[PDB]
């Protein structure tokens, strides 16, 4: 696999040992052949699990998730998918790695799609080798793959709201359950219902992932209520997965706004990864997987593929050449390579709105392409009245950096900035000029 001009997909079934058995062996061969290598982890939690599998090998951990003393003798670098894409965007010179390893290469976040595009382009050019590690490569139609031990698969109606009757099987369980919900607000309702019934619940989501995941190892729990973030390598000591088979889909309407569409069916890749959390112990057969819907190809027209094109159009590759998306996922968006290329100063603003502003890619691009500077927040209040952000069914208000109380009404409306309480509080802070 380590021969240049070669991209290998390592598609062993979930729990076959890609991370703990195959990855250390690849690292050893790369160090023997003096290949400057990058290892890309989807989350800080997977990076910490990788340090355990790679302990004793000279790897440089470019993450704050691991507390190791780097000697300077390392030719292998380990960083998160988002860190790699960020460093490509920023004016930091990233080495041109001879070997690129992506763990959980199925991740559909824009920074992961961009990383796959950049890497696969470098391989197509004959400049580098790559390895994509995932049980569910882009374009999988099988949601029931192999596992370490047999899983009991059951199609059943799954509640997506609080309940009093009709779902006795949910609370009649004596083990540990991982429940995938389409959104944070949906998770809150189900968690409140389980807690009222005397159950110990941990909730997980993108923003609180590292902190709450530690609670899954540190204390006894009955249920874990999570969003799709737990599809990226998160390991649990569970015996059942309850799967709504639903997700939210960010959609760009008329090229003017972003809505969160659905809940709608997940892809086969997500269903296989959610099911993949159980049946991982060969000595314990009979783990259950209860699913409450079918799969569909909801990644076509999904805003993340357009956002990944916005990122690759602003990453330098070679003169005016721009990286293409990784071929099996390239038709998920109708986009021309280069259409989102920004001039030097607008590009710098685009990077800063994402890095410091913490805004979604699409929204950061609308602001930067309009020729607005990072600290100028007048666009958060001058949008049409239909763009009024609402808090508790009344218009949201913020004190501007001028000491004037104004209704939050952005020129470009992106539902992700107000999808939950934490997202709205963070966007109010940005509109206030607090970061
Ligand atoms: O909202 C805006 N702030 C600004 O400085 C501009 C002025 C006119 C066009 N360039 C950007 N717009």
Swiss-Prot record:
ATP binds at residues 12-19. Residues 150-329 form the Helicase C-terminal domain. Residues 1-155 form the Helicase ATP-binding domain. It comes from the Viruses. It is a peripheral membrane protein. A motif (DEAH box) lies at residues 103-106. Acetylated by host KAT5. Acetylation modulates NS3 RNA-binding and unwinding activities and plays an important positive role for viral replication. Residues 1-435 are lumenal. The modification N6-acetyllysine is found at residue 207. It is found in: Host cytoplasm; Host endoplasmic reticulum membrane. The record marks 274, 277 as: Involved in NS3 ATPase and RTPase activities. Displays three enzymatic activities: serine protease, NTPase and RNA helicase. NS3 serine protease, in association with NS2B, performs its autocleavage and cleaves the polyprotein at dibasic sites in the cytoplasm: C-prM, NS2A-NS2B, NS2B-NS3, NS3-NS4A, NS4A-2K and NS4B-NS5. NS3 RNA helicase binds RNA and unwinds dsRNA in the 3' to 5' direction. Leads to translation arrest when expressed ex vivo. Disrupts host centrosome organization in a CEP63-dependent manner to degrade host TBK1 and inhibits innate immune response. Inhibits the integrated stress response (ISR) in the infected cell. Forms a heterodimer with NS2B. Interacts with NS4B. Interacts with unphosphorylated RNA-directed RNA polymerase NS5; this interaction stimulates RNA-directed RNA polymerase NS5 guanylyltransferase activity. Interacts with non-structural protein 2A. Interacts with host SHFL; this interaction promotes NS3 degradation via a lysosome-dependent pathway. Interacts with host CEP63; this interaction disorganizes the centrosome and inhibits host innate immune response. This is Serine protease NS3. It comes from Zika virus (ZIKV).
